[PDB]
Design a protein around this ligand. Sequence first.
Ligand SMILES: [Zn+2]
Lengths: 201, 54, 314, 253, 311, 58, 39, 49, 142, 111, 50, 53, 55
Amino acid sequence: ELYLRSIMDHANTPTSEPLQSFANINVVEKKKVPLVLAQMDELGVPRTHLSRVLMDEVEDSLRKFQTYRSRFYEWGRAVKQFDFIEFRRRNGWLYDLHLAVATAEIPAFFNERPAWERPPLEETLYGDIYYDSLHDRSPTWMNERYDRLYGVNHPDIAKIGIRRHLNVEYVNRKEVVERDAALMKKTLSSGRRLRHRVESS
Amino acid sequence: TLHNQRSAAPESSVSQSHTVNAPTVDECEMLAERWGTMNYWHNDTFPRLVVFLK
Amino acid sequence: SYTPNLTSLTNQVNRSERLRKWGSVGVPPGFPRIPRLEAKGIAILHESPKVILAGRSRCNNFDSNQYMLINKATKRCLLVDASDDWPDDWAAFIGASDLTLTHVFLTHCHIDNIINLNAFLTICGSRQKEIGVMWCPAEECWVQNFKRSCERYGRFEEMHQVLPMMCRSLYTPQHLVDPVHLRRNDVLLSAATNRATSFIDFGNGVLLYYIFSPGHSPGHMMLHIPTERILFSGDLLFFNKVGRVDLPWATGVRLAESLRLLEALPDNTVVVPGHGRMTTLGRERRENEALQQCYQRQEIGKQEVSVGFNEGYL
Amino acid sequence: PNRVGLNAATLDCRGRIYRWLRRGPFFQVDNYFRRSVKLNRDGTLPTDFVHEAPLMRKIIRLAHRGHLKAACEEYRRVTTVPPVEVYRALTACCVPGAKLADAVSIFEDGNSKLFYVSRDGEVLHNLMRCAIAARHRARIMWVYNVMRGRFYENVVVRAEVDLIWRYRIAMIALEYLLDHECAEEAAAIYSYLVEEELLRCDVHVRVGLHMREAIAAGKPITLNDDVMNATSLVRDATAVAPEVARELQRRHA
Amino acid sequence: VNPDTSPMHWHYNLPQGMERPHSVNRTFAAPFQSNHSLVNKYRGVWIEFDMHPAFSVALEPQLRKLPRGRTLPKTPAEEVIADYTALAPLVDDEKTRDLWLAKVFQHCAFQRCGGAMELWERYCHQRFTAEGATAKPPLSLVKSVLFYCNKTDNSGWRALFDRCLKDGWNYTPLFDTAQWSFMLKSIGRMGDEDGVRAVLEEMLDVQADLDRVEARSVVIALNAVTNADVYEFVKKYLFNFGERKVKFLRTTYSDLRGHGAGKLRIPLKENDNMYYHVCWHSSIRSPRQNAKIDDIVKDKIEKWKAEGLLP
Amino acid sequence: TEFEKRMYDIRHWLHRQTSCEFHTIYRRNVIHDSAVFPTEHDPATPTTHEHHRMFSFA
Amino acid sequence: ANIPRSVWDPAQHNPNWSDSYGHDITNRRAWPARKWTVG
Amino acid sequence: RMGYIPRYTPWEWIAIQEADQPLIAEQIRQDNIGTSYFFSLNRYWRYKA
Amino acid sequence: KTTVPSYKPQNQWEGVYYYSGITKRQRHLILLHRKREREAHMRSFNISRASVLQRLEQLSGDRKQESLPPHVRLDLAVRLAQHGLYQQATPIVDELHHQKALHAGHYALLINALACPRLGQRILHCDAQCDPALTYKLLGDE
Amino acid sequence: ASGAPDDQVQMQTDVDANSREVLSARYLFNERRLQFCDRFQNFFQSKLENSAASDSNGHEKQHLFSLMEACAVIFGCETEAARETYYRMFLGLDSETLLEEDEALRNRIAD
Amino acid sequence: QNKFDIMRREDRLSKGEQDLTERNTIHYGVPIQQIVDEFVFRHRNARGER
Amino acid sequence: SFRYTNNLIGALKHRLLLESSYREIASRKFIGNCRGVEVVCSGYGTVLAVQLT
Amino acid sequence: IVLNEQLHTVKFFDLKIGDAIRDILQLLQRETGVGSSVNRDTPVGISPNNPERRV
Ligand SMILES: [Zn+2]
């Protein structure tokens, strides 16, 4: 009785305001109630010899953190989950707790220019130690291609452009960059042909 | 804003079982009924067996 | 589409329509960017002693065409619409051809036309180093709703991008910055398009005549070339269709009048639409049933005749 | 009788095919079990099944003869809910071998999975005897806790043990605990006995047997302090009292 | 226009840490609610039995023939009636005699032997219901007699329930959902409209599970409604049930009037007014898927007479 | 068991598109009840290969 | 408890723990090659 | 700061995620009785081995 | 700066929905049952206290001049102090001490019974919410 | 929208559809406004934390956050017309409103 | 609510110790890692102090 | 609602209980002993007698 | 101190409009009729504080 009551008191204690941003963190402490119950079952202490109030709280904690294998195998059916959703919609005002501010209200930097135009900041970001064998020649030939956008160094190809997004393609990078290279080859050749035609005409 | 909870330094990692301290009056009184390793009875600095004999 | 007010949220017919139109997913998939894996190259559609035309057919998933005129004498290029999903291809094209991009002639300010205007201007200006925008001021209504269409069609990246036509041009009071931004080259066209004076001198004696042809958009402007018989209609006259009228500020009667504004041009005038295949004015007069209705109602005596498409604009 | 038997549907529609592909791990078995076996409208168990009746009689006979393994093999074939006598006989044949593991397994199989058919005073008495033979203190307390039960079984399911069986089980448990000097556990069981006001239940039972004889005679019946004290048990205990008191005096000294 | 506030794949080079925790179950503590009923529930009327052990083991040879917890022996009710008539006077403990009489009443109810009101009159009636008497019968005996009367439907239920009201034994707040369902079923079969109104009002006052009542019993009690005043009472009372209970009520009433009419012991009578009203109420709850006037008239007629339009 | 609980609770905040499985090797006491499993002299008539034939296990 | 004492208790703070910026700044540090006269 | 994505899940987040979900009854793994040599594999058919 | 009142990846950090918690009616019924149990315990304690005080009065009426054997008086004083009637038991222990009938065991028995075990049980079950720690706090005010 | 690059500032908003709670209501600032906010907050943290127990206020508290951000938006502006527009949006008290109030007071003194 | 608790509170305050009511909530203050990282961040690597 | 009715029920119950306790205090016997001087007094304060055991 | 408290309410006018509109929506989604017998604590047709609360 004393240990379980201590568990419940710890669980019910509220926590500091900054840590109360999401939920009451200390409720996790009810998850040890089944553990203590199993320890009692092994120690031979009957759980029926518990106060009615403590048994009410113990059953609350059990229905919160406990399920059986039979329940678990059906625990997650779309029917049950959609019943949960519809029941929340119908009666959230009866059971929902909602029915700190400066945490969610803080000015944030904004990338004004498009992603291709401005490389996003987050994208740009991404022997024995104690008893100190530098460049042991590590033969890597005894034991066992990349592709660029073709326009890295060209006075005609703009350095900035939407083609920069091709740099973050992986599954078909070879084919996509090959097609891009062919397209740029053809466009440059046709532009040069027009330049020559206009000059000669 | 240190905290409102109690504070306790980390629990010592020095093996109290292997560390042997100076003899205490009650330990000497009960020496006739105590157990100990050969190290306990022939400690380099606190020869509990010599104490028991004396 | 439109803001979800309390009625829009408490209406059951809205949810029924959402389920039926787009299946179990209540949102539309919108029109995404065409992948680089399936993008064509610019083709040369016309070669003339004075000017030449170069374009791409299916530039957007909206199936909008991109066109560019090259003066061949002043080495001046001019994009018609900023509709190409890949403007840097045009940038490299003009860089290789050694051309100077001076203007972008927005026939009208629908999303399929204005989606990539900022990207075009940025890339082309970067290669140049200003580029002007020629548009009808009647479409500030579409310009200020540019964000709404982008949100509807899922073009989020271009959503938070102020349009270049909104940046305090010469017709607008300029900023008074502290002693411790202006676009001079852009022009605004007038709805009183005359066959004598309303034009722009592309150079070398080529005059580009713009025509005010509303009905699909309030400030729709066609472009005409009465020297090579070329007509950039744009969302107005397609191969076998006409512009839509199911849009805000879209009027069937004014669309019909805009159609009638083409009754004097020569039959061998090739019309390059804003979408789809190139056709000719004679074929449109002879085989286009929308135009046939526009004239048959007038014949039988409809006082206020309205025509227009309601299912899809190419 | 002639209507027992369950028919099955067919997978013809695409909707039902998807139903079949989305069925849970236990669909055929769970649905068949819940269609065949259900509580009766009057609350009586589905125990009385004519087709399985001789099988259950065979189970009872084998359990009484002591063939626990054969009885379990036959029980494996049971399709409906077996009678409480089957569990009684199984635990009875388990008691002599002190096979508390098998007895607890049988009780658990019959307790929560089959409408608490096995939650019987005699079944729990046999479980307690198994635990006593095994000298398993923790399981003695487990059986006492189980026979006390919870709200779900006592009120909602209305499957509770009778007062006489509760008294007998607690009496044997407390006897063993006091014999082996289990102070805290004997104290817990005695606290339960005083809460239940069950201290003089042996004398009440003796008075009840005498009342039953008097009824068979035709004699009137009453329960009073004089009736309780007229029994040999109380008179003899009171006569022996002084010897016990002086013996405690000696032992305390 | 008026600007709108801007609201907010994942690359493999990113940390792949979880964006934010989610606590839905702890925010909304959803009570367990399942379409299927409890499989371990005791679908019957439980009568508490706390017979003193001495008397119980003295009467074991007599009680073995009675129905114990979840046990219903098929012995004829007549042998039990004779056992009680012969022995109950012999034993001299009022409470155990009342308990034995209640168990005999339950056996008679389940055997449909009738006439146990004769025993009620012989022993129990005079102390409790005959006239002004302060003696309070045990709740077990009250439950057993009401259950017997409801099963072998008899008219004494009204008299006994009236005493069970607050101004009296005040036991009605202690009756179960099953006992309420049985009372409503029997009242509906016997066709007591005012009795149905009284039972429904007392149930609403005692706060029983209105939506956990047997649907067939509630349906019979509703079909037993024809009086205009109790009809309006039911019209207002239907809103107390759950929105999912009303739909099942409509389905059960339709099924019983249609296909499952044979599952009733006695055929249900035709109340198309109840059927229509229940259907309308279910559809409503579910989704969508004067002297001065006479004076005016006579004045206008007099005027028209003046105009001569009415010769 | 507290550590087992806190270890099992990892799958709920596991990283994106990453899964986990748990292997537990623990010491457990097993009794060899010589009464239920006794040692007996090899029977007078010993088993032959026929008793271990196909479908003999059943 | 749920949150280990070593996180919030000042008494159990690790003296040898270092900040979150200095080590990475040092790693990003580029040291010019030791320029000898011949090699 | 900008583009800061934590490299470790905060204790508060871990506690929330751990509280959000239940336990499985068998995970406790208690075997104080012994092994049933006669019935555990001859249990009722519905929940049989 | 106006807002907009709106409302195949899966969130792997959102737990499954399961039915945890009780209903309003079930909570009310739990309260009702606990209150009925509290009434039962209070009734038991009051009946026992009344019976003991009645015994005290009957014994006093009988003992107007007759003196009872020391053991019955010891038992009655112990029961009074057990039920919390310590002030009613001071005369009995005083006269037993003057008559010199109390011994080592009896004095400790009386001082232990003086702690009011029955009253403590009533407080535990009724007013201390079955809290053994709060039972000591609530016994000190009496 | 026309505005000026340094004048027009937008607000990011996000609200839960179930708990009906604002999970985001902030301003989209540039580096200058963010640096002003940082200067303000770091300067006030150096003394308000030492002087205030923050037993219930909290350690991460943002002191005068609304005044700080309402001043930061104006600080980041580059045009007097835009600064006055933001002033009016902030409880009025712009130049024209204060001048109208002064006019009313000067007419009331004569009366 | 209890005279026992009020007396305990006053006695503990007179003795000069933390009151048991102050512990009715759990307040993990800012840890030293947090404080040190805040210091180094505000001081731009604290090159002067290293 | 019914605030005064409930408060009056409670106050009447309290005062009825106090009057019942008074009826016993008055009837009770209060004995004070100091050095063999037994003063027997009623619940009112009336010195019933001053004896010496 | 006074101004800061005033400016913190000014920017939330639109958000409170939205919260009100959202509250109306959740109102229209709740169960029709009176509260079901299962999700109801107080008795229907009687004030919860009625001295004749119980039968
Ligand atoms: Zn268009």
